[PDB]
């Protein structure tokens, strides 16, 4: 498109 | 399109 | 379209 | 109470 | 309470 | 058996 | 048996 | 409380 | 058996 954002993420977090 | 956002996410979180 | 947002997410959360 | 245990868990296991 | 245990866990295991 | 394959897998993928 | 395949899998995918 | 334990964990294990 | 393959895997991929 004109202003594309593609964001892909995956995470393991040990507690917040 | 014009202003596309594609967001894909998957996560494992050890407790909030 | 003009202002598309596509969001896909899947998660495993160890307790809130 | 007096002797509280709160346990929350969620998991993905690739086969036992 | 008096003797609180709070346990939160989430895991991905590649086969047992 | 004779020609055994045992495959166990589990995964978190942040978007394909 | 003779030619056994055992496959076990479980996954979380953040969008295809 | 008096004797609090808070435990939060999350893990990826490549096979046991 | 005779020709055993045992494969165990688990993974977090930040987007393909």
CSV table of N, CA and C in Angstrom, one decimal:
chain,number,residue,atom,x,y,z
A,1,UNK,N,0.8,-1.2,0.0
A,1,UNK,CA,0.0,0.0,0.0
A,1,UNK,C,0.9,1.2,0.0
A,2,UNK,N,0.4,2.4,0.5
A,2,UNK,CA,1.2,3.6,0.7
A,2,UNK,C,2.0,3.6,1.9
A,3,UNK,N,1.5,3.3,3.1
A,3,UNK,CA,2.1,3.6,4.4
A,3,UNK,C,2.3,2.3,5.3
A,4,UNK,N,2.5,1.2,4.7
A,4,UNK,CA,2.4,-0.1,5.3
A,4,UNK,C,3.2,-0.3,6.6
A,5,UNK,N,2.6,-0.8,7.6
A,5,UNK,CA,3.3,-1.4,8.8
A,5,UNK,C,3.0,-2.9,8.9
A,6,UNK,N,4.0,-3.7,8.8
A,6,UNK,CA,3.8,-5.2,9.1
A,6,UNK,C,4.5,-5.4,10.4
A,7,UNK,N,3.8,-5.9,11.5
A,7,UNK,CA,4.5,-6.2,12.7
A,7,UNK,C,4.2,-7.7,13.1
A,8,UNK,N,5.2,-8.5,13.3
A,8,UNK,CA,5.1,-9.9,13.7
A,8,UNK,C,5.9,-10.0,15.0
A,9,UNK,N,5.3,-10.6,16.1
A,9,UNK,CA,6.0,-10.7,17.4
A,9,UNK,C,5.6,-12.0,18.1
A,10,UNK,N,6.6,-12.7,18.7
A,10,UNK,CA,6.3,-13.7,19.7
A,10,UNK,C,7.2,-13.8,20.9
A,11,UNK,N,6.7,-14.0,22.1
A,11,UNK,CA,7.6,-13.8,23.3
A,11,UNK,C,7.2,-14.8,24.4
A,12,UNK,N,8.2,-15.1,25.2
A,12,UNK,CA,8.2,-15.8,26.5
A,12,UNK,C,8.6,-14.9,27.6
A,13,UNK,N,7.8,-14.5,28.5
A,13,UNK,CA,8.1,-13.6,29.6
A,13,UNK,C,7.9,-14.3,31.0
A,14,UNK,N,8.9,-14.2,31.9
A,14,UNK,CA,9.1,-14.9,33.1
A,14,UNK,C,8.2,-14.5,34.3
A,15,UNK,N,7.1,-13.8,34.0
A,15,UNK,CA,6.3,-13.1,34.9
A,15,UNK,C,6.4,-11.6,34.8
A,16,UNK,N,5.3,-10.8,34.8
A,16,UNK,CA,5.3,-9.4,34.9
A,16,UNK,C,5.4,-8.9,36.3
B,1,UNK,N,-4.1,-1.5,0.8
B,1,UNK,CA,-4.9,-0.2,0.9
B,1,UNK,C,-4.0,1.0,0.9
B,2,UNK,N,-4.5,2.1,1.5
B,2,UNK,CA,-3.7,3.3,1.6
B,2,UNK,C,-2.8,3.2,2.9
B,3,UNK,N,-3.4,3.0,4.1
B,3,UNK,CA,-2.7,3.2,5.3
B,3,UNK,C,-2.5,1.9,6.2
B,4,UNK,N,-2.2,0.7,5.5
B,4,UNK,CA,-2.3,-0.6,6.1
B,4,UNK,C,-1.5,-0.8,7.4
B,5,UNK,N,-2.1,-1.4,8.4
B,5,UNK,CA,-1.4,-2.0,9.5
B,5,UNK,C,-1.8,-3.5,9.5
B,6,UNK,N,-0.8,-4.4,9.4
B,6,UNK,CA,-1.0,-5.8,9.7
B,6,UNK,C,-0.2,-6.1,10.9
B,7,UNK,N,-0.9,-6.6,12.0
B,7,UNK,CA,-0.2,-7.0,13.2
B,7,UNK,C,-0.5,-8.5,13.5
B,8,UNK,N,0.5,-9.3,13.7
B,8,UNK,CA,0.4,-10.7,14.0
B,8,UNK,C,1.2,-10.9,15.3
B,9,UNK,N,0.6,-11.5,16.4
B,9,UNK,CA,1.4,-11.8,17.6
B,9,UNK,C,1.0,-13.1,18.3
B,10,UNK,N,1.9,-13.8,18.9
B,10,UNK,CA,1.6,-14.9,19.8
B,10,UNK,C,2.6,-15.0,21.0
B,11,UNK,N,2.1,-15.2,22.2
B,11,UNK,CA,3.0,-15.1,23.4
B,11,UNK,C,2.6,-16.1,24.5
B,12,UNK,N,3.7,-16.4,25.2
B,12,UNK,CA,3.6,-17.2,26.5
B,12,UNK,C,4.1,-16.4,27.6
B,13,UNK,N,3.3,-16.2,28.6
B,13,UNK,CA,3.6,-15.2,29.7
B,13,UNK,C,3.4,-15.9,31.0
B,14,UNK,N,4.4,-15.9,31.9
B,14,UNK,CA,4.6,-16.7,33.1
B,14,UNK,C,3.7,-16.3,34.3
B,15,UNK,N,2.7,-15.6,34.1
B,15,UNK,CA,1.9,-14.9,35.1
B,15,UNK,C,2.0,-13.4,34.9
B,16,UNK,N,0.9,-12.7,35.0
B,16,UNK,CA,0.9,-11.2,35.2
B,16,UNK,C,0.9,-10.8,36.6
C,1,UNK,N,-9.0,-1.8,1.6
C,1,UNK,CA,-9.8,-0.6,1.6
C,1,UNK,C,-8.9,0.6,1.7
C,2,UNK,N,-9.4,1.7,2.4
C,2,UNK,CA,-8.6,2.9,2.6
C,2,UNK,C,-7.7,2.8,3.8
C,3,UNK,N,-8.2,2.4,5.0
C,3,UNK,CA,-7.5,2.6,6.3
C,3,UNK,C,-7.4,1.2,7.0
C,4,UNK,N,-7.1,0.1,6.3
C,4,UNK,CA,-7.2,-1.2,6.8
C,4,UNK,C,-6.3,-1.5,8.1
C,5,UNK,N,-6.9,-2.1,9.1
C,5,UNK,CA,-6.2,-2.8,10.2
C,5,UNK,C,-6.6,-4.2,10.2
C,6,UNK,N,-5.6,-5.1,10.0
C,6,UNK,CA,-5.7,-6.5,10.2
C,6,UNK,C,-4.9,-6.9,11.4
C,7,UNK,N,-5.6,-7.5,12.5
C,7,UNK,CA,-5.0,-7.9,13.7
C,7,UNK,C,-5.3,-9.4,13.9
C,8,UNK,N,-4.2,-10.2,14.0
C,8,UNK,CA,-4.3,-11.7,14.3
C,8,UNK,C,-3.5,-11.9,15.6
C,9,UNK,N,-4.1,-12.6,16.6
C,9,UNK,CA,-3.3,-12.8,17.8
C,9,UNK,C,-3.7,-14.2,18.4
C,10,UNK,N,-2.8,-14.9,19.1
C,10,UNK,CA,-3.1,-16.1,19.9
C,10,UNK,C,-2.1,-16.3,21.0
C,11,UNK,N,-2.5,-16.5,22.2
C,11,UNK,CA,-1.6,-16.5,23.4
C,11,UNK,C,-2.0,-17.5,24.5
C,12,UNK,N,-0.9,-17.9,25.2
C,12,UNK,CA,-1.0,-18.7,26.4
C,12,UNK,C,-0.5,-17.9,27.6
C,13,UNK,N,-1.3,-17.7,28.6
C,13,UNK,CA,-1.0,-16.8,29.7
C,13,UNK,C,-1.1,-17.6,31.0
C,14,UNK,N,-0.1,-17.6,31.8
C,14,UNK,CA,0.1,-18.5,33.0
C,14,UNK,C,-0.7,-18.1,34.2
C,15,UNK,N,-1.8,-17.3,34.1
C,15,UNK,CA,-2.5,-16.7,35.1
C,15,UNK,C,-2.4,-15.2,35.1
C,16,UNK,N,-3.6,-14.5,35.1
C,16,UNK,CA,-3.6,-13.1,35.4
C,16,UNK,C,-3.5,-12.7,36.8
D,1,UNK,N,-7.5,-16.2,53.5
D,1,UNK,CA,-7.7,-17.0,54.6
D,1,UNK,C,-6.4,-17.2,55.4
D,2,UNK,N,-6.3,-18.4,56.1
D,2,UNK,CA,-5.1,-18.7,56.8
D,2,UNK,C,-3.9,-19.2,56.0
D,3,UNK,N,-4.2,-20.3,55.2
D,3,UNK,CA,-3.1,-21.1,54.6
D,3,UNK,C,-3.2,-21.1,53.1
D,4,UNK,N,-3.6,-20.0,52.4
D,4,UNK,CA,-4.0,-19.9,51.0
D,4,UNK,C,-2.9,-20.4,50.0
D,5,UNK,N,-3.4,-21.3,49.1
D,5,UNK,CA,-2.6,-21.6,47.9
D,5,UNK,C,-3.5,-21.1,46.7
D,6,UNK,N,-3.0,-20.2,45.9
D,6,UNK,CA,-3.6,-19.9,44.6
D,6,UNK,C,-2.6,-20.4,43.5
D,7,UNK,N,-3.1,-21.3,42.7
D,7,UNK,CA,-2.3,-21.9,41.6
D,7,UNK,C,-3.0,-21.6,40.3
D,8,UNK,N,-2.4,-20.9,39.3
D,8,UNK,CA,-2.9,-20.7,38.0
D,8,UNK,C,-1.9,-21.2,37.0
D,9,UNK,N,-2.3,-22.0,36.0
D,9,UNK,CA,-1.3,-22.5,35.0
D,9,UNK,C,-2.0,-22.7,33.6
D,10,UNK,N,-1.2,-22.5,32.6
D,10,UNK,CA,-1.7,-22.9,31.2
D,10,UNK,C,-0.5,-23.3,30.3
D,11,UNK,N,-0.6,-24.4,29.6
D,11,UNK,CA,0.6,-25.0,28.9
D,11,UNK,C,0.2,-25.6,27.5
D,12,UNK,N,1.3,-25.6,26.7
D,12,UNK,CA,1.2,-26.3,25.4
D,12,UNK,C,2.3,-27.4,25.4
D,13,UNK,N,2.0,-28.6,25.3
D,13,UNK,CA,2.9,-29.7,25.4
D,13,UNK,C,2.9,-30.5,24.0
D,14,UNK,N,4.1,-30.7,23.4
D,14,UNK,CA,4.3,-31.2,22.1
D,14,UNK,C,4.1,-32.7,21.9
D,15,UNK,N,3.3,-33.3,22.8
D,15,UNK,CA,3.2,-34.7,22.9
D,15,UNK,C,3.9,-35.2,24.2
D,16,UNK,N,3.2,-36.0,25.0
D,16,UNK,CA,3.7,-36.7,26.1
D,16,UNK,C,4.4,-38.1,25.7
E,1,UNK,N,-3.3,-13.5,53.3
E,1,UNK,CA,-3.5,-14.3,54.5
E,1,UNK,C,-2.3,-14.4,55.4
E,2,UNK,N,-2.1,-15.6,56.1
E,2,UNK,CA,-0.9,-15.8,56.9
E,2,UNK,C,0.2,-16.4,56.0
E,3,UNK,N,0.0,-17.6,55.3
E,3,UNK,CA,1.0,-18.4,54.7
E,3,UNK,C,1.0,-18.4,53.2
E,4,UNK,N,0.6,-17.4,52.5
E,4,UNK,CA,0.2,-17.3,51.1
E,4,UNK,C,1.3,-17.9,50.2
E,5,UNK,N,0.9,-18.8,49.3
E,5,UNK,CA,1.6,-19.2,48.1
E,5,UNK,C,0.7,-18.8,46.9
E,6,UNK,N,1.3,-17.9,46.0
E,6,UNK,CA,0.7,-17.6,44.7
E,6,UNK,C,1.6,-18.2,43.6
E,7,UNK,N,1.2,-19.2,42.8
E,7,UNK,CA,2.0,-19.7,41.8
E,7,UNK,C,1.3,-19.5,40.4
E,8,UNK,N,2.0,-18.9,39.5
E,8,UNK,CA,1.5,-18.7,38.1
E,8,UNK,C,2.5,-19.3,37.1
E,9,UNK,N,2.1,-20.2,36.2
E,9,UNK,CA,3.1,-20.7,35.2
E,9,UNK,C,2.5,-20.9,33.9
E,10,UNK,N,3.3,-20.7,32.8
E,10,UNK,CA,2.9,-21.2,31.5
E,10,UNK,C,4.0,-21.7,30.6
E,11,UNK,N,3.9,-22.8,29.9
E,11,UNK,CA,5.1,-23.4,29.3
E,11,UNK,C,4.8,-24.1,28.0
E,12,UNK,N,5.8,-24.1,27.1
E,12,UNK,CA,5.8,-24.9,25.8
E,12,UNK,C,6.9,-26.0,25.9
E,13,UNK,N,6.5,-27.2,25.8
E,13,UNK,CA,7.4,-28.3,26.0
E,13,UNK,C,7.5,-29.1,24.7
E,14,UNK,N,8.7,-29.3,24.1
E,14,UNK,CA,8.9,-29.9,22.8
E,14,UNK,C,8.7,-31.4,22.7
E,15,UNK,N,7.9,-32.0,23.6
E,15,UNK,CA,7.8,-33.4,23.8
E,15,UNK,C,8.4,-33.9,25.1
E,16,UNK,N,7.7,-34.7,25.9
E,16,UNK,CA,8.2,-35.3,27.1
E,16,UNK,C,8.9,-36.6,26.7
F,1,UNK,N,9.5,-51.1,16.8
F,1,UNK,CA,9.3,-51.8,15.6
F,1,UNK,C,10.6,-52.0,14.8
F,2,UNK,N,10.6,-52.0,13.5
F,2,UNK,CA,11.8,-52.0,12.6
F,2,UNK,C,12.3,-50.6,12.4
F,3,UNK,N,11.5,-49.7,11.8
F,3,UNK,CA,12.0,-48.4,11.3
F,3,UNK,C,11.4,-47.2,11.9
F,4,UNK,N,11.3,-47.2,13.3
F,4,UNK,CA,10.5,-46.3,14.0
F,4,UNK,C,10.9,-44.8,13.8
F,5,UNK,N,9.9,-43.9,13.6
F,5,UNK,CA,10.1,-42.5,13.8
F,5,UNK,C,9.1,-42.0,14.9
F,6,UNK,N,9.6,-41.4,15.9
F,6,UNK,CA,8.8,-40.7,16.9
F,6,UNK,C,9.1,-39.3,16.8
F,7,UNK,N,8.1,-38.5,16.4
F,7,UNK,CA,8.3,-37.0,16.4
F,7,UNK,C,7.3,-36.3,17.3
F,8,UNK,N,7.9,-35.5,18.2
F,8,UNK,CA,7.1,-34.7,19.2
F,8,UNK,C,7.4,-33.2,18.9
F,9,UNK,N,6.5,-32.3,18.7
F,9,UNK,CA,6.9,-30.9,18.6
F,9,UNK,C,5.8,-29.9,19.2
F,10,UNK,N,6.3,-28.8,19.8
F,10,UNK,CA,5.3,-27.7,20.1
F,10,UNK,C,5.9,-26.3,19.9
F,11,UNK,N,5.2,-25.4,19.3
F,11,UNK,CA,5.8,-24.1,18.9
F,11,UNK,C,4.9,-22.9,19.1
F,12,UNK,N,5.5,-21.7,19.3
F,12,UNK,CA,4.9,-20.4,19.3
F,12,UNK,C,5.4,-19.6,18.1
F,13,UNK,N,4.6,-19.2,17.2
F,13,UNK,CA,5.1,-18.5,16.0
F,13,UNK,C,4.5,-17.1,15.9
F,14,UNK,N,5.2,-16.0,15.9
F,14,UNK,CA,4.8,-14.6,16.0
F,14,UNK,C,4.1,-14.1,14.8
F,15,UNK,N,3.5,-14.9,14.0
F,15,UNK,CA,2.9,-14.6,12.7
F,15,UNK,C,3.7,-15.3,11.5
F,16,UNK,N,3.0,-15.9,10.6
F,16,UNK,CA,3.6,-16.4,9.3
F,16,UNK,C,3.6,-15.3,8.3
G,1,UNK,N,4.8,-52.1,15.2
G,1,UNK,CA,4.7,-52.7,13.9
G,1,UNK,C,6.0,-52.8,13.1
G,2,UNK,N,5.9,-52.8,11.8
G,2,UNK,CA,7.1,-52.8,11.0
G,2,UNK,C,7.7,-51.4,10.8
G,3,UNK,N,6.9,-50.5,10.2
G,3,UNK,CA,7.3,-49.2,9.7
G,3,UNK,C,6.7,-48.0,10.5
G,4,UNK,N,6.6,-48.1,11.8
G,4,UNK,CA,5.9,-47.1,12.6
G,4,UNK,C,6.3,-45.7,12.5
G,5,UNK,N,5.3,-44.8,12.3
G,5,UNK,CA,5.5,-43.3,12.5
G,5,UNK,C,4.5,-42.9,13.6
G,6,UNK,N,5.0,-42.4,14.7
G,6,UNK,CA,4.2,-41.7,15.8
G,6,UNK,C,4.5,-40.2,15.7
G,7,UNK,N,3.5,-39.4,15.4
G,7,UNK,CA,3.7,-37.9,15.4
G,7,UNK,C,2.7,-37.3,16.4
G,8,UNK,N,3.2,-36.5,17.3
G,8,UNK,CA,2.5,-35.7,18.3
G,8,UNK,C,2.9,-34.3,18.1
G,9,UNK,N,1.9,-33.3,18.0
G,9,UNK,CA,2.3,-31.9,17.9
G,9,UNK,C,1.2,-31.0,18.5
G,10,UNK,N,1.6,-29.9,19.1
G,10,UNK,CA,0.7,-28.9,19.6
G,10,UNK,C,1.3,-27.5,19.4
G,11,UNK,N,0.6,-26.5,18.9
G,11,UNK,CA,1.2,-25.2,18.6
G,11,UNK,C,0.2,-24.0,18.8
G,12,UNK,N,0.8,-22.9,19.0
G,12,UNK,CA,0.2,-21.6,19.0
G,12,UNK,C,0.8,-20.7,17.9
G,13,UNK,N,-0.1,-20.2,17.0
G,13,UNK,CA,0.4,-19.5,15.8
G,13,UNK,C,-0.3,-18.1,15.9
G,14,UNK,N,0.5,-17.0,15.8
G,14,UNK,CA,0.1,-15.6,16.0
G,14,UNK,C,-0.6,-15.0,14.9
G,15,UNK,N,-1.3,-15.8,14.0
G,15,UNK,CA,-1.8,-15.4,12.7
G,15,UNK,C,-1.0,-16.0,11.6
G,16,UNK,N,-1.7,-16.6,10.6
G,16,UNK,CA,-1.1,-17.1,9.3
G,16,UNK,C,-1.2,-16.0,8.3
H,1,UNK,N,0.9,-10.8,53.0
H,1,UNK,CA,0.6,-11.7,54.2
H,1,UNK,C,1.8,-11.7,55.1
H,2,UNK,N,2.0,-12.8,55.9
H,2,UNK,CA,3.2,-13.0,56.7
H,2,UNK,C,4.3,-13.7,56.0
H,3,UNK,N,4.1,-14.8,55.3
H,3,UNK,CA,5.2,-15.6,54.7
H,3,UNK,C,5.1,-15.8,53.2
H,4,UNK,N,4.7,-14.7,52.5
H,4,UNK,CA,4.4,-14.8,51.1
H,4,UNK,C,5.5,-15.4,50.2
H,5,UNK,N,5.1,-16.3,49.3
H,5,UNK,CA,5.8,-16.7,48.1
H,5,UNK,C,5.0,-16.4,46.9
H,6,UNK,N,5.5,-15.6,46.0
H,6,UNK,CA,5.0,-15.4,44.7
H,6,UNK,C,5.9,-16.0,43.7
H,7,UNK,N,5.5,-17.0,42.9
H,7,UNK,CA,6.3,-17.6,41.8
H,7,UNK,C,5.6,-17.5,40.5
H,8,UNK,N,6.3,-16.9,39.5
H,8,UNK,CA,5.9,-16.7,38.2
H,8,UNK,C,6.9,-17.4,37.2
H,9,UNK,N,6.5,-18.3,36.3
H,9,UNK,CA,7.5,-18.9,35.4
H,9,UNK,C,6.9,-19.1,34.0
H,10,UNK,N,7.7,-19.0,33.0
H,10,UNK,CA,7.3,-19.5,31.7
H,10,UNK,C,8.5,-20.0,30.9
H,11,UNK,N,8.4,-21.1,30.2
H,11,UNK,CA,9.6,-21.8,29.6
H,11,UNK,C,9.3,-22.5,28.3
H,12,UNK,N,10.3,-22.6,27.5
H,12,UNK,CA,10.4,-23.4,26.2
H,12,UNK,C,11.5,-24.5,26.4
H,13,UNK,N,11.1,-25.8,26.4
H,13,UNK,CA,12.0,-26.9,26.6
H,13,UNK,C,12.1,-27.7,25.3
H,14,UNK,N,13.3,-27.9,24.8
H,14,UNK,CA,13.4,-28.6,23.5
H,14,UNK,C,13.3,-30.1,23.4
H,15,UNK,N,12.4,-30.7,24.3
H,15,UNK,CA,12.3,-32.1,24.6
H,15,UNK,C,12.9,-32.5,25.9
H,16,UNK,N,12.2,-33.3,26.7
H,16,UNK,CA,12.7,-33.8,28.0
H,16,UNK,C,13.4,-35.2,27.7
I,1,UNK,N,14.1,-50.0,18.5
I,1,UNK,CA,13.9,-50.8,17.3
I,1,UNK,C,15.2,-51.0,16.5
I,2,UNK,N,15.2,-51.1,15.2
I,2,UNK,CA,16.4,-51.2,14.4
I,2,UNK,C,16.9,-49.8,14.1
I,3,UNK,N,16.1,-48.9,13.5
I,3,UNK,CA,16.6,-47.7,12.8
I,3,UNK,C,16.0,-46.4,13.5
I,4,UNK,N,15.8,-46.4,14.8
I,4,UNK,CA,15.1,-45.4,15.5
I,4,UNK,C,15.5,-43.9,15.2
I,5,UNK,N,14.5,-43.0,15.0
I,5,UNK,CA,14.7,-41.6,15.1
I,5,UNK,C,13.7,-41.1,16.1
I,6,UNK,N,14.2,-40.5,17.2
I,6,UNK,CA,13.4,-39.7,18.1
I,6,UNK,C,13.7,-38.2,17.9
I,7,UNK,N,12.7,-37.4,17.6
I,7,UNK,CA,12.9,-36.0,17.4
I,7,UNK,C,11.9,-35.3,18.3
I,8,UNK,N,12.4,-34.4,19.2
I,8,UNK,CA,11.7,-33.5,20.0
I,8,UNK,C,12.0,-32.1,19.8
I,9,UNK,N,11.1,-31.2,19.5
I,9,UNK,CA,11.4,-29.8,19.3
I,9,UNK,C,10.4,-28.8,19.8
I,10,UNK,N,10.8,-27.7,20.4
I,10,UNK,CA,9.9,-26.6,20.6
I,10,UNK,C,10.6,-25.2,20.4
I,11,UNK,N,9.8,-24.3,19.8
I,11,UNK,CA,10.4,-23.0,19.3
I,11,UNK,C,9.5,-21.8,19.4
I,12,UNK,N,10.2,-20.6,19.6
I,12,UNK,CA,9.5,-19.3,19.5
I,12,UNK,C,10.1,-18.5,18.3
I,13,UNK,N,9.3,-18.2,17.3
I,13,UNK,CA,9.8,-17.6,16.1
I,13,UNK,C,9.2,-16.2,16.0
I,14,UNK,N,10.0,-15.1,15.9
I,14,UNK,CA,9.5,-13.7,16.0
I,14,UNK,C,8.8,-13.2,14.7
I,15,UNK,N,8.2,-14.1,13.9
I,15,UNK,CA,7.6,-13.8,12.6
I,15,UNK,C,8.4,-14.5,11.5
I,16,UNK,N,7.8,-15.1,10.6
I,16,UNK,CA,8.4,-15.7,9.4
I,16,UNK,C,8.4,-14.7,8.2
